[PDB]
Amino acid sequence: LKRDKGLDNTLKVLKQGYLYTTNQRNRLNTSVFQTKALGGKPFVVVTGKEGAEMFYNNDVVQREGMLPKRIVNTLFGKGAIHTVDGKKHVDRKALFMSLMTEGNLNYVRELTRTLWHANTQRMESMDEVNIYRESIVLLTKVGTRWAGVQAPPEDIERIATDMDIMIDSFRALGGAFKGYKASKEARRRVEDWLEEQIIETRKGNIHPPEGTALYEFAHWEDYLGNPMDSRTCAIDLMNTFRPLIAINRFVSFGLHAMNENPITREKIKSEPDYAYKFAQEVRRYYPFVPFLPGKAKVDIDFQGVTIPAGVGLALDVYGTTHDESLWDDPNEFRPERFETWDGSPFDLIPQGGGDYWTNHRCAGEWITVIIMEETMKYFAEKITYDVPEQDLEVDLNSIPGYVKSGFVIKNVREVVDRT
Numbered sequence: 001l002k003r004d005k006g007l008d009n010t011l012k013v014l015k016q017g018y019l020y021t022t023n024q025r026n027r028l029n030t031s032v033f034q035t036k037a038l039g040g041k042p043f044v045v046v047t048g049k050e051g052a053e054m055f056y057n058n059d060v061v062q063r064e065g066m067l068p069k070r071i072v073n074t075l076f077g078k079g080a081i082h083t084v085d086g087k088k089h090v091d092r093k094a095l096f097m098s099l100m101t102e103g104n105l106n107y108v109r110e111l112t113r114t115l116w117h118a119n120t121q122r123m124e125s126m127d128e129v130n131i132y133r134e135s136i137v138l139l140t141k142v143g144t145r146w147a148g149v150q151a152p153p154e155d156i157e158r159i160a161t162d163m164d165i166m167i168d169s170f171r172a173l174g175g176a177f178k179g180y181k182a183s184k185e186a187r188r189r190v191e192d193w194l195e196e197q198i199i200e201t202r203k204g205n206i207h208p209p210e211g212t213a214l215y216e217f218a219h220w221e222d223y224l225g226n227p228m229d230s231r232t233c234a235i236d237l238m239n240t241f242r243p244l245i246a247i248n249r250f251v252s253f254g255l256h257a258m259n260e261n262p263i264t265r266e267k268i269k270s271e272p273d274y275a276y277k278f279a280q281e282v283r284r285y286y287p288f289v290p291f292l293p294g295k296a297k298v299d300i301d302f303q304g305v306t307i308p309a310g311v312g313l314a315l316d317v318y319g320t321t322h323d324e325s326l327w328d329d330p331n332e333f334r335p336e337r338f339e340t341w342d343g344s345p346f347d348l349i350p351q352g353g354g355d356y357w358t359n360h361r362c363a364g365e366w367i368t369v370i371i372m373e374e375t376m377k378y379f380a381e382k383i384t385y386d387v388p389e390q391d392l393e394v395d396l397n398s399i400p401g402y403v404k405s406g407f408v409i410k411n412v413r414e415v416v417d418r419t
């Protein structure tokens with residue numbers, strides 16, 4: 001079992017970012033390796049389909065307790081679904097998945113399409129539109145409404161900003177950074193506000209629609225017949241739409257991709273299947289989630305070596321989505337690759353792998369793709385616009401992945417046949 005040696009390579013991991021793991025596999029000339037990080041803790045980095053399958057084998061891998069505390073405190077919240085395993089997890093996960101019915105899924109599509117269509121005049125009116133910002137604000141309106149939480153127009157910009165800070169707060173991989181405390185306070189204001197909606201819903205003072213997150217979460221009872229405590233229920237309710245808001249990252253990358261490959265734009269208009277492929281290739285190609293932590297419960301024999309009981313595990317998400325034997329030309333943006341992809345739960349894992357109900361796999365993958373399809377359809381067909389000179393760098397050596405400028409556009413104009 002090969003090592004990237006050192007007492008703690010966290011700073012090295014941060015210096016190399018999304019390419020750390022790949023650099024180590026190249027240099028140590030291997031498919032699996034160990035590295036200490038996050039305070040001397042050894043972690044075995046596993047990759048590919050075979051890495052993904054093992055990582056999501058619940059007989060052998062523990063997730064509970066393996067997220068760094070600072071990230072729990074900012075990104076996901078204390079007591080959040082991400083932090084529990086076993087029965088308690090399967091029970092609550094089923095609540096999240098119960099929201100993903102056909103009707104609710106079409107509702108997010110319609111809300112997304114309606115808001116973009118409604119937002120054209122406003123974007124025509126601006127000198128420049130930063131798409132990162134404009135999409136986070138718009139998706140804050142989609143996400144609150146979808147979740148049955150009523151956020152006035154007046155408050156949306158505040159809430160968007162607070163979400164933005166939270167979503168960014170995995171940048172230091174759980175270490176201290178200057179934004180930490182501002183991230184915690186953003187979380188606290190968001191949790192406080194959602195807790196009040198839960199308590200008020202429970203008292204019968206407001207009346208969210210049945211089948212919405214706010215309603216289902218507020219009234220749900222776990223397998224022992226107990227409701228979630230109010231704060232915990234607020235933490236998990238936020239987990240139902242803060243990540244929807246985080247799709248703003250992909251909206252920005254999506255425009256970057258379309259701009260660099262103008263051919264994809266024409267095909268988005270010409271071919272009805274194609275918006276789906278584009279959306280999928282945005283999620284595979286661009287960086288967001290670098291890797292996921294777990295822990296070996298027992299000794300595991302894997303790819304010729306034995307992973308000892310108690311050692312950390314890290315599933316390489318970026319490495320697997322760019323693994324040259326799973327994806328022909330992994331570093332070329334090619335939506336057509338998804339005409340042939342067989343839908344395996346272990347190769348396209350940029351939002352996790354495994355099974356939705358029994359693993360920690362992302363509950364909102366279908367929403368993510370639905371929202372990317374409508375959004376990219378809107379930017380391809382409904383407006384025209386200019387891309388001025390700006391920093392369009394996506395730095396793969398820096399977590400989290402962003403377009404440096406956010407992707408700025410100008411001279412937006414609606415596409416309308418008036419003859």
Ligand code: HEM
Pocket residue numbers: 081082083093096239240241243244245246247248249288289292350351352353359360361362363364365367368
């Ligand atoms: C910005 C796009 C998103 C990305 C990059 C993302 C990524 C992920 C990842 C990597 C996980 C963990 C998988 C694991 O631990 O094995 C996760 C879990 C989760 N995602 Fe997402 N996700 C996104 C959007 C969404 C959306 C829109 C929703 C809901 C509307 C959502 C809801 C969740 C929930 C509830 C979990 C926890 C699942 C569990 O612990 O069982 N995510 N997501």
